[PDB]
Amino acid sequence: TTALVCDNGSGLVKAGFAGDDAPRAVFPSIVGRPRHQGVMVGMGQKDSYVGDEAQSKRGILTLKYPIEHGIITNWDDMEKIWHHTFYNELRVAPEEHPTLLTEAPLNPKANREKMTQIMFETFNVPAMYVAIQAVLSLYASGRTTGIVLDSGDGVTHNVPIYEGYALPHAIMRLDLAGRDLTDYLMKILTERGYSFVTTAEREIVRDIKEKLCYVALDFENEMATAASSSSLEKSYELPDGQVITIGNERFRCPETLFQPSFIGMESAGIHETTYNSIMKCDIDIRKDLYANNVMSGGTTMYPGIADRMQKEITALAPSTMKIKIIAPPERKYSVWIGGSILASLSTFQQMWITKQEYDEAGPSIVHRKC
Amino acid sequence: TTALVCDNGSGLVKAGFAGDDAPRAVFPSIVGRPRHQGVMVGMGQKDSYVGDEAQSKRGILTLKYPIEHGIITNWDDMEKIWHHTFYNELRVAPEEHPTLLTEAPLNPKANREKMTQIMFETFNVPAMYVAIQAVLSLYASGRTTGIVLDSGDGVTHNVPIYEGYALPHAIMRLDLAGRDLTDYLMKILTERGYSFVTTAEREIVRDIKEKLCYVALDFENEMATAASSSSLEKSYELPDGQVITIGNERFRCPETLFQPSFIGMESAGIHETTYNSIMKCDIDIRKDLYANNVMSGGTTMYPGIADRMQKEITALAPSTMKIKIIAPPERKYSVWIGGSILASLSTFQQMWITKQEYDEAGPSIVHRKC
Amino acid sequence: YLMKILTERGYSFVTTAEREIVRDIKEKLCYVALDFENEMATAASSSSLEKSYELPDGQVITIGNERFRCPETLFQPSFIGMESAGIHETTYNSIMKCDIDIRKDLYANNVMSGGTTMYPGIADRMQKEITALAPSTMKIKIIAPPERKYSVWIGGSILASLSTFQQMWITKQEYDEAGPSIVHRKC
Amino acid sequence: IDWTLLEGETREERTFRNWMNSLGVNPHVNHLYADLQDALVILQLYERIKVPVDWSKVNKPPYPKLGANMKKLENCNYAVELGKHPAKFSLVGIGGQDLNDGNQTLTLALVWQLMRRYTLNVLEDLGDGQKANDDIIVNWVNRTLSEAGKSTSIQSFKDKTISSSLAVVDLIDAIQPGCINYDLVKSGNLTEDDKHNNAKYAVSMARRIGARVYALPEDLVEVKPKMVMTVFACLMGRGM
Ligand SMILES: Nc1ncnc2c1ncn2[C@@H]1O[C@H](COP(=O)(O)OP(=O)(O)O)[C@@H](O)[C@H]1O
Ligand SMILES: Nc1ncnc2c1ncn2[C@@H]1O[C@H](COP(=O)(O)OP(=O)(O)O)[C@@H](O)[C@H]1O
Ligand SMILES: Nc1ncnc2c1ncn2[C@@H]1O[C@H](COP(=O)(O)OP(=O)(O)O)[C@@H](O)[C@H]1O
Ligand SMILES: [Mg+2]
Ligand SMILES: [Mg+2]
């Protein structure tokens, strides 16, 4: 009938139908289990909480993410989220819809193979496909040339594409994304005396990060600005009514994207990783890659992150090239939007991994067809 | 019915209609094929890139020349260039036009036989003819006496003609031309740290050839001038914005024409090859040949090439002859220009190889009629 | 490239200290396949090519297919995105650029040196690949001494101990006059 | 009918553009390298040259804002595919993305072969079968004009007497006596400039009777022999 587009990120699940312009279901990719003692009869019958109900009852739960750094680490909890996606949030029978799934590059091969076997044997989909997330972000931009910087909850990765051809040797992947920024904001919030330890309190710090944090155009003068004045101070009200104030941690947290040494990592920032990915490409295609730096994912939604990238790559570029970052306001769903474009094309209808092909080749068919 | 004049050399294709004074289509004779992985649907459909498009998208292609040293080495890719020439660049049906083709002297006989078979059995031309390039370059100058130095991309050859009579025993041929100067410039550019390896980077070095290289009048004083001062230094901007500087390789690259031992060849330079061809001619026609040295082809376009041939031959000549180099500004199309002159003559209309003659004698007809 | 293809099994090495671990894995477990397409079919069926390696922290990683796919980049540089030809074709192309009279003696003396020529099966593969490119009446002979890793040093101690070499040094007096450019004349 | 000269446009592109509009494509082609990029006009011209087009494989001009370029790129891939196998054109090195990008050389490499096929079909339905000839159609006009009787008779298409449109307007009313209309015709008092007006005066009514003439008036004022024969070939079909 119609195809399902499911983008399983580390943090959020984006699901919907091919041909729409926005996902129908966006809920956190968590599973919660009660950690206290049930005393009222008839109220402890529920063994697990999955979607937004795991988030609303998080005070009495321990929260687990099945996906970490793009790799599915819990396969029983992943089937819970897929059951929640198909039957509760989209309310469709998966046996009638081909399903399009997404994955990051440079990812273990058993990950792609297991989600193929899950969809065919547990959910019994007629066909499926696994696409690369950065390729789909280029579909959403209406482009066939450009280097994509995708930064979500688990993985930051770069994929150069020129005229619809990918250069895999230039694909660069960094395991630094939003969940690592949230954990660093927790670590530096203790400097002002605010302590967040519980997995439920980690969801609070993520809410603080998405509201008050921003990228400084020049990091060393924001530090001098915040040291002398209090014009960067901002307040946040906790769920119990307490009020916390941060002035310096607002831009020290996203600065880990450009200085990964803040969290003790030896890697280079996202500006140098993009430039190094371009310099691994043929000298003829570099001018077009400099002019199409496509941004994607929720970790690129900080205020002032495209101004900071445009300034940092310009300092590394040969001063004759013109640098252009395309950061659309719909960045958070570019991977999903591009997936619904791809699954709607009639030229794509012969590239599904049909169940017939899976029955004769097994779960390894996904490596040849994707 | 207007005749077609296709002067396809090792480097470029020159095509047009007999009667015009300049070729209508001048594109590189290359065929590119994608070397990378196609990821976006609807973009991997093109299997071959032929004309200037292969030059536009060379970043993702491996570029092959179907012609090497005047000899067609890839007959499947040579038909692509001819199909592109007739249908895309000229937009004529070959079944209605006699086609004039060119070829270098002392060339394998199967090359001329097989390009006669292609023209009759694949393109189904009404008539065709194969002409020697150095003879056509003499029509273009409006002469009937002279010795032609033809230097293109693959072959350098000398042909002496007197009163419209060729002296075949004095015909010279040197397999050292523009392409071998490109490969020498790539090799000596690494002395400054500039590395060009791929087939797409050879096109960048050829571009540096045609814009910055010149012929030294006296090689040993230019070498001492460039060593002391810095006035011969020049800069060039690569496609990605990097700036390279060369000061000494400008005149050492074309010096290989006069000292073929720079690339490990035992042959003599072009100045001693044209002189050896004169000394193989009858003593009575030598004075006329000394005063008509006709240069043609792109490799004769270096600044100072004609003043150096004048000086070098004068040192070998008997000091009472007067040496005259004829280097018209339209040198690059003399072979094509002279072929449009020849195909326009009414005297020539009985010299075509018609299809009826080919149907009774096969491809060998070209050996007796041309 | 071994680091890049180790992530297919879930082994992530990203730091400059972890690159020294991958170098150690390469030198101990990698080998050149005589026929690449048959070894790929062999590893895809059984697990007799699998081997284990213990990391400095005690973790044990297993590779079965990356063992010969890593040195295969020498013969197929397109694995790492390069357009160049393999070391067997580059060696053959160097011979074909030489005088036709000296090619028979070059075919019979193919000398390898350096650490990257120390993979098990590298000389058998070069022997087989050049033979397929040679005119079938020549004799291809690869010379791979067990002391390959120090051939450049060993030959430099032979050269520097010769008495005829003692006039080929660039002395300090020569450098004091011509400057650092003296090295281009004497060497 | 539009007869105007653009600032930059070669005579080859004017002939192709005029042939498209005079053939009845649903949009009005104003720029060749800007109106063919969705391949809808090209797919329409395939029907005019007896090439079957499966319209279930074509994306209709209402395009979603998301993935519109991929929708148009699929159309260009179908147009190039139909040119190779069933149309038997020679399209070497041409893909769908060349039409979609508006490549000037490779767009003209396809449209000139469409026009050649269209003219070839005009020259074959005039006869019984697979015969196409020029001197059969030149004495036809010299014969059908004797029914009324007028001093207009040409030897071939290269004659300079058809420099003015007096010879073609002499034939335009022989088939249809209801289009006499010699009000604006000129005879004997014509310069080089004023015969452009009657050339348009003659070509314009050819579509009124039913002769689908796709030649420019400039192709008639001068004696371009390949386009003037199309005018008489298109007039024969309306006549007989
Ligand atoms: N406006 C925002 N500012 C800063 N961070 C944000 C914003 N919106 C979302 N994020 C972060 O982005 C991450 C989710 O991004 P997303 O692309 O949905 O991840 P995934 O690819 O795993 O679904 C979360 O870690 C969240 O904290
Ligand atoms: N201005 C220039 N200066 C020096 N060399 C040139 C110049 N223009 C073209 N060339 C050389 O001319 C060659 C092509 O010449 P051409 O006469 O077309 O050869 P062919 O007859 O083989 O096609 C190229 O290899 C290029 O290096
Ligand atoms: N047994 C082995 N098998 C495979 N590779 C090896 C082996 N021993 C050394 N190498 C590789 O060869 C290189 C040895 O360095 P060497 O040959 O001395 O190079 P260089 O001359 O540049 O110093 C190292 O990079 C190492 O990775
Ligand atoms: Mg994501
Ligand atoms: Mg030539």
Author numbering:
A (entry chain C), B (entry chain A): 5 to 374
C (entry chain B): 188 to 374
D (entry chain F): 388 to 627
Give verbatim excerpts from the published study on this entry.
Here we focus on human T-plastin, a member of the plastin/fimbrin family of tandem calponin-homology domain (CHD) proteins. T-plastin is a 70.8 kDa monomeric protein that functions as a key actin network stabilizer, strengthening and promoting cell protrusions by localizing to lamellipodia and filopodia. While most cross-linkers bridge filaments through the dimerization or tetramerization of subunits featuring a single actin-binding domain (ABD), plastins contain two ABDs (ABD1 and ABD2) within a single polypeptide chain, each composed of two tandem CHDs. They also feature a flexibly tethered N-terminal regulatory domain (RD) consisting of two Ca2+-binding EF-hand motifs, which inhibits bundling activity in the presence of Ca2+ while still licensing binding to single actin filaments by unclear mechanisms.
We obtained a 3D reconstruction using IHRSR as implemented in RELION 3.0 (54) at a global resolution of 2.6 Å. Local resolutions ranged from 2.4 Å to 3.9 Å, radially decaying from the core of the filament, facilitating direct atomic model building and refinement for the complete sequence of Mg–adenosine phosphate α-actin and T-plastin residues 388 to 630. Despite using the full-length protein, density for only two CHDs was observed. The map resolution allowed us to unambiguously identify them as CH3 (olive) and CH4 (dark green), constituting ABD2 and a short segment of the CH2–3 linker (light green) at the N terminus of CH3. The essentially uniform ABD2 decoration in the dataset indicates that when T-plastin engages F-actin, ABD2 must bind first. The robust actin binding by ABD2 furthermore indicates that Ca2+ suppresses T-plastin–mediated actin bundling by inhibiting the subsequent actin binding of ABD1 after ABD2 has engaged, rather than downregulating initial F-actin binding. Like many other ABPs, T-plastin’s CH3 domain of ABD2 engages a major site spanning the longitudinal interface of two adjacent actin protomers, which we term actin I and actin II (numbered from the plus/“barbed” end of the filament), while CH4 does not directly engage actin. Helices H1, H3, and H4 constitute the actin-binding surface (ABS) of CH3, mediated by an extensive hydrophobic interface between H3, actin II, and actin I’s D-loop, as well as salt bridges between H1/H4 and actin I. However, CH4 undergoes an ∼30° swing around the CH3–4 linker to avoid a steric clash with actin, licensing a major rearrangement of the short stretch of the CH2–3 linker resolved in the cryo-EM map: a 180° flip away from the actin filament. In our high-resolution actin-bound structure, CH2–CH3 linker residue W390 engages a series of hydrophobic residues along CH3 H1, suggesting a role in mediating the docking of the CH2–CH3 linker after ABD2 initially engages a filament.
